[PDB]
Design a protein around this ligand. Sequence first.
Ligand SMILES: Nc1ncnc2c1ncn2[C@@H]1O[C@@H]2COP(=O)(O)O[C@H]3[C@@H](O)[C@H](n4cnc5c(N)ncnc54)O[C@@H]3COP(=O)(O)O[C@H]2[C@H]1O
Ligand SMILES: Nc1ncnc2c1ncn2[C@@H]1O[C@@H]2COP(=O)(O)O[C@H]3[C@@H](O)[C@H](n4cnc5c(N)ncnc54)O[C@@H]3COP(=O)(O)O[C@H]2[C@H]1O
Ligand SMILES: [Ca+2]
Ligand SMILES: [Cl-]
Lengths: 141, 135
Amino acid sequence: LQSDQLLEATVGQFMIEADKVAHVQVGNNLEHALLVLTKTGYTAIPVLDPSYRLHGLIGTNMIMNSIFGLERIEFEKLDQITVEEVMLTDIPRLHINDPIMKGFGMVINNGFVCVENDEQVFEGIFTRRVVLKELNKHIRS
Amino acid sequence: LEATVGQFMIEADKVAHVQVGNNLEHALLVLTKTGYTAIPVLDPSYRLHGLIGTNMIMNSIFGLERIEFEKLDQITVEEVMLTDIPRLHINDPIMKGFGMVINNGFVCVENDEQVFEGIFTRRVVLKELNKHIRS
Ligand SMILES: Nc1ncnc2c1ncn2[C@@H]1O[C@@H]2COP(=O)(O)O[C@H]3[C@@H](O)[C@H](n4cnc5c(N)ncnc54)O[C@@H]3COP(=O)(O)O[C@H]2[C@H]1O
Ligand SMILES: Nc1ncnc2c1ncn2[C@@H]1O[C@@H]2COP(=O)(O)O[C@H]3[C@@H](O)[C@H](n4cnc5c(N)ncnc54)O[C@@H]3COP(=O)(O)O[C@H]2[C@H]1O
Ligand SMILES: [Ca+2]
Ligand SMILES: [Cl-]
């Protein structure tokens, strides 16, 4: 894309596709979510329902806050609590056809924003890195 | 583009941090309570030694058979922290910091004496970029 086209593009053209996005499900326990976060190295990831609709975000700091006990880390709670009981549900959302400038504005306060289609099926994520890489390339010109 | 990193950075007195010698249980508590996913590690002379984050700490105790949470207070931050990190000076042009936050959520700023001065964050960059293109 040329500079005069970039600001005319859509969020979907620059999102990380869902098949490359690490995620978990509302009904998984915190142990599984902590495993996925730790093994993928991401600090927060999408939470989907069984029909692939976005319901929230789950991150390592959220999980640790739920098991940090008075005197010890209550690791047994990882198997006893589900991610939907701990996940953040007030998250921003983008549509695949949203103008890219909307996404540029939404990553000011968010490291990534989830993207969905007309039927609320999860389509991928719109990340700061992709924005910064692209804007750098074009500013430099 | 005529601006400097020091003009837009988050000043050090606003920055959450831990110190060399603190253990990982303390660092993990600070990360969890402040909500930040990675923060600087300083020494008593306020010099920057590295960055510590929640993912690093988890990976240091996540075993094949169990998560060894009970070892957190036996490991120091310097045994786990990331040390191969970019650095900026307060007088660096903003476009230099812009390039460094492509691969880093934040980049530490220090003076010519190696004293920590603040952090240059993606949010500050994105705020300014949004202003320039929206004009
Ligand atoms: N494996 C890796 N290789 C190279 N660089 C890496 C990396 N993991 C993290 N980074 C760098 O660290 C930044 C922050 O990652 P974090 O996990 O806190 O925060 C991430 C994470 O919460 C989420 N994310 C990114 N890619 C993801 C994926 N494939 N699946 C699930 N979540 C993802 O979006 C946030 C922003 O990601 P963004 O790429 O803008 O920014 C990333 C990236 O620049
Ligand atoms: N209390 C809060 N209030 C409002 N928004 C919040 C927030 N905590 C996090 N965020 C939002 O989440 C983004 C990523 O935070 P994270 O902790 O993964 O990654 C952060 C954290 O690693 C570090 N950081 C930012 N501010 C810090 C501070 N005052 N002290 C220590 N580290 C800081 O710099 C990274 C990039 O931060 P940036 O501000 O660009 O981007 C932040 C910010 O937009
Ligand atoms: Ca909201
Ligand atoms: Cl970030």
